[PDB]
């Protein structure tokens, strides 16, 4: 109960220190390119895309979700925590160039992430033992100039959602994990 409150306070301090620092909001994401294939009905889409100038905003709203889940075994306190941005949204903006057949346009994209959540684990004999950005519950993609009824939108939005669940989540983990490690293990 007291250990739970101390861990809550330490987590809140880590969050505040990371947010008071730059690089977290807006957060740069390295450029990413990919080939892709999808099948939409009878249409067989094969093409390539590139995402540049990728920026994530909204992580200044990171907030501990509920008490630290604390359990003590063999004189070591273990705690798992969730930190998220559930009331607000984390938005990714980027320039998208894609090639499909004779189409090679560049457009601007806004991708909204719902329920951005980080799972974290601590051990107190504080050492951080686990840190991950959980899979996104939903990614809403707005691709400039494309109708939501366009099959090209369907393909591009599906490929982009997969890229967010893979590359983007890995890059955000790369940035966030050492920041939290530094703040908590001090």
């Amino acid at each position: 109960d007291k250990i739970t409150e101390e861990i809550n306070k330490a987590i809140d301090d880590a969050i505040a220190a990371i947010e008071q620092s730059e690089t977290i909001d807006p957060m740069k994401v390295p450029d990413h390119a990919d080939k892709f294939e999808r099948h939409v009905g009878i249409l067989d889409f094969k093409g390539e895309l590139a995402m540049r100038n990728i920026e994530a905003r909204g992580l200044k709203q990171m907030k501990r979700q509920g008490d630290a889940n604390v359990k003590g075994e063999e004189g070591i306190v273990k705690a798992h925590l969730l930190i998220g941005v559930h009331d607000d949204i984390v938005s990714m903006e980027y320039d998208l160039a894609y090639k499909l057949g004779d189409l090679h346009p560049t457009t601007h994209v806004i991708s909204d992430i719902q329920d951005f959540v980080v799972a974290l684990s601590l051990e107190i004999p504080i050492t951080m033992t686990s840190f991950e950005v959980r899979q996104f519950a939903n990614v809403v993609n707005h691709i400039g100039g494309l109708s939501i009824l366009d099959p090209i939108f369907g393909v591009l939005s599906d490929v982009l959602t997969a890229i967010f669940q893979d590359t983007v989540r890995k890059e955000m983990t790369k940035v966030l994990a050492p920041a939290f490690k530094r703040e908590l293990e001090k």
Binding site: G41, I42, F45, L100, D102, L149, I152, G154
Partner: protein
């Protein structure tokens, strides 16, 4: 029905732009078959609103069209 008419007019214009863009990726006949299947699904959805069979690979379109129609109807 002027409201239904404005919806169908805007929808046909969106479909025309989609058809033009698809003709830059696929052959003419494939695009025509795809547009025909799409219009069939649109018809079924609109008639049901006035369980819908959905061809494989078009489930995304069914969800997106529900979102599009609800958006335009709340706008109208």
């Amino acid at each position: 029905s002027p409201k239904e008419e404005k919806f169908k007019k805007k929808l046909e214009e969106e479909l025309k732009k989609i058809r033009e863009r698809l003709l830059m990726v696929f052959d003419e006949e494939r695009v025509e078959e795809y547009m025909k299947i799409m219009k069939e699904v649109i018809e079924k959805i609109l008639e049901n609103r006035k369980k819908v069979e959905i061809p494989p690979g078009m489930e995304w379109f069914y969800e997106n069209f529900l979102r599009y129609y609800d958006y335009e109807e709340e706008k109208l």
